[PDB]
Each structure stands twice: as structure tokens, then as C-alpha cells.
Amino acid sequence: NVAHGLAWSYYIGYLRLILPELQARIRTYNQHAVSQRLYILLPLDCGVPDNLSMADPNIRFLDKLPQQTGDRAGIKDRVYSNSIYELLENGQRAGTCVLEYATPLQTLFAMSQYSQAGFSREDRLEQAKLFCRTLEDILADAPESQNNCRLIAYQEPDDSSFSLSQEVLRHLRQEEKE
Amino acid sequence: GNFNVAHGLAWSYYIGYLRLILPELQARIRTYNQHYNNLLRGAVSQRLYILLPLDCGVPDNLSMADPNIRFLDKLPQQTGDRAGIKDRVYSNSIYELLENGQRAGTCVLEYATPLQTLFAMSQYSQAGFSREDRLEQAKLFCRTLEDILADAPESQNNCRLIAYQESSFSLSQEVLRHLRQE
Ligand SMILES: Nc1nc2c(ncn2[C@@H]2O[C@@H]3COP(=O)(O)O[C@H]4[C@@H](O)[C@H](n5cc(-c6ccccc6)c6c(N)ncnc65)O[C@@H]4COP(=O)(O)O[C@@H]2[C@@H]3O)c(=O)[nH]1
């Protein structure tokens, strides 16, 4: 139940507002190069650094997209912002895409840290998996949504085996095979 | 069941919004009044007023909800690098409350956005929630929020919840009764 409202929160409050307009934001920037899907990272351990360079230094910030505004909930001119990132291979750019973590997992982490929330670390992993499931299902019955974005769910055990940069690039190159 | 959904959303609203803005809020307001509002009976108040309509009916534009609520200006914006999003923007709007053709108050006013999700979830088949579910959920959302705020280090007389059931009714009047109470 907890993760269910979180998943609908994410779609209703954010994904259904911005995705419909994402290509126009790209085409604006691209013409005056970046892939036209939003890449959303879903780390099941819910460990989410505000800076991606923390998760892999081969992930460097490049630019912001043009902002988007909605008047919503009686707040005037609410701003939706996204960041473009380069992904490095042997010190040199290999890819470019719009990239971010799903914020609702950062909420799930903090709830596990605060006593009044009554939420164990075991609860957090199950709610994380649940969150991923629900979001995936919502995004299937909404093709106008799925076709503008790509989800990546994964799990880490300190495993020096794992490069977030390499995994994204694996997904980027595999899109180019279509 | 209807507890855990509501519970979840209340924590989300604290973690991801309230605990980040409530601390700076009074500085933001104070700056606004000193430099841009030398109206002696027309200052902005020091609390954020959060409308909690219990049917989860949330329009996007507060002005169309009631004509005695007029948009005036925005506080200076607050930004944070969040989850890989460089420069996320938290923003708040100042509204004038009109009564008997006069100005009766000025405050920072908004709906609790999470209520929009409770509505949708009771409209979409896939979510599987009734209207009665939504009403139970909205009640528990307010209760959990109150509990959270009563123990929160960021809440320091810098917040007020306004819950109401929702013709003849007037939103501004409702907000004015809370303003006057202080
Ligand atoms: N009043 C107000 N509330 C805010 C604000 N930011 C967050 N919250 C509320 O706090 C709770 C926990 O927030 P998150 O943990 O960040 O989850 C979000 C988030 O990943 C994604 N998203 C929501 C907003 C956005 C913008 C304006 C108003 C409300 C929300 C948003 C954004 N501009 N930029 C990038 N992602 C965003 O959609 C999920 C559901 O969002 P909401 O249901 O609409 O409201 C949230 C939520 O209920 C704000 O500026 N103003």
C-alpha cells in the first residue's frame, strides 16, 4: 500500500505532466546528440545521491533542458527541470542522455531512518520492489508514457564489479539497435 | 490498508517538501515584507497555510476556486540539487483575501498536492480504490501529518493545516477564520 501511493504519486504528479512535452524540449535544445527518452534509475537499495558523479565519476553533468511550467495546486508557475549527462569511456565521451533517479525511493529510504514512520530495512526492500512493479504496470497501459522513457531497476551487493555508466551505455547502444 | 497508503503519502510530503522549505520560510517572508511590502495593515503572515479539502477536490488555480482570493506575487524562489536534477525549484505564491470589497488578509496559500493522487487512485480501475476509500484515506492523511508536525524540528509556528468538507461556501472566509484566530 505504501509503495502503491508512491507509484501513483510519481505518475500523477510528475510523469504524465512532463513526458507529453519531453520531445519538444529536446528538439528545441538539440537543434539549438541527446537521445529523446528519459532514463530513470531505480536502485532497489534506495541509495540515491543528489549528485550522480558520486555513483560513478564517469557520469558528468553537461546541461539543463529548457524548463517547463505548470500552474498546479494553486501554486503559480511551478517549474519542472531535468539534466543532461555525458557518459565517459576511457576519459572520453561515449553517450549523452537525460538521466535521473526516481525521487520516491529517496523518500522510502528516509522513512526507514525515522522511528515515527515505523518502517524496517526489510520493509524498505519489499516496498522498493513493489514500487517498481506498480510503476511498470501503470506505464504499460499508457504507451504515450512508456515510449518516451526507459526504466532501469538493479541491485548492488561493495561490488567493484558494477559501473552505472557502463550499464546506461549498454542500454543506450541497445536502443540504437532499433 | 487505507492507513498505509495515507501514511506513505504523509511521510513523502514531509520528507520531500515540508522539511526542506519550512526552515527557510520565515526568512523568505521577512525579506519579502521588508523590501517589497511596506503596507502597514497588509503584511504577509509568517505561516504557510495548507488547504486540505476532504473530498480531495483540488483545482489547479486558486483564483477560480473563489473570486475573493486574488494572486498578488511570489516569494523569492528556493532551489536544491535533488536526485540528479540540477537546480530543482521550490516556489510559493502570495494571495490577497478579499472581504466586503476590502482586503482582509495576506498569506502564502496552497493545496496539499498529495490529495490529487488520492483522487486519481479512486478514479482509475488499476488502482482499485472506492470513493469511501478516498475519504478514509484523506482523513488519515491529515492525522498523520498533524502527528508528524507536532514532533517535527522544522515546524516552529511556520505551518497551519486547514481542513474542511466541501454553493454558499467561501474558501477565503474559511482561511480568514484561521488567520484571525492567531
Ligand atoms: N506543494 C509542493 N509539493 C512538492 C514539491 N516538490 C515535491 N512536493 C511534494 O512532496 C511529496 C514528495 O515529493 P517527491 O518525493 O519529490 O515525489 C514527487 C517527485 O519525484 C515528482 N515531482 C513532483 C514535482 C512537483 C512539482 C511541483 C509541485 C509538486 C510536485 C516535481 C518537480 N517540480 N520536479 C521534479 N520532480 C517532481 O513526483 C512525485 C509526486 O509529487 P507530488 O505528489 O505532486 O507532490 C510532492 C509529493 O507529494 C513542490 O515544489 N511543491
Author numbering:
A (entry chain B): 154 to 185, 193 to 317, 319 to 339
B (entry chain A): 151 to 316, 321 to 336
What do the paper's sentences say?
Cyclic dinucleotides (CDNs) are second messengers that activate stimulator of interferon genes (STING). The cyclic GMP–AMP synthase (cGAS)–stimulator of interferon genes (STING) pathway is an important player in detecting damage-associated (DAMPs) and pathogen-associated molecular patterns (PAMPs).1−4 Upon dsDNA detection in cytosol, cGAS synthetizes a STING ligand 2′3′-cGAMP (1a, cyclic [G(2′,5′)pA(3′,5′)p] with mixed 2′–5′ and 3′–5′ phosphodiester linkages). To understand the interactions of large moieties in position 7 of 7-deazaadenine in 2′3′-cGARMPs, we crystallized human wild-type STING truncated to residues 140–379 in complexes with 5f, 5k, 5l, and 5m using our improved STING crystallization protocols. The binding site is formed at the interface of two STING monomers and is covered by two “lids” (residues 227–241).
After proving that there might be space for the introduction of larger substituents in the binding site of STING, we introduced phenyl (5f), small heterocycles (5n, 5o), and pent-1-ynyl (5e) into position 7 of 7-deazaadenine. Surprisingly, we found that ΔTm for 5f, 5n, and 5o decreased by less than 3 °C, and EC50 values in the digitonin assay for these compounds did not increase by more than 2-fold compared to 5c. Moreover, for compounds 5f, 5n, and 5o, we observed restored activity in the standard assay, which was deteriorated for 5c and 5d. We also solved the crystallographic structure for 5f in complex with STING. Considering the structure of 5f, we hypothesized that there exists a possibility of intramolecular stabilization through π–π stacking between phenyl and guanine at 5f that might help to improve its activity. The main difference between the binding of the 5f molecule and the binding of the natural ligand 2′3′-cGAMP that we observed is the interaction of 5f with Tyr240. By modifying 7-deazaadenine with phenyl, we displaced Arg238 from chain B; we also brought additional intramolecular stabilization of the ligand conformation through cation−π stacking of the phenyl moiety with guanosine on the opposite side of the molecule. However, this interaction was not sufficient and resulted in lower stability of STING-5f in DSF compared to 2′3′-cGAMP and 5b.
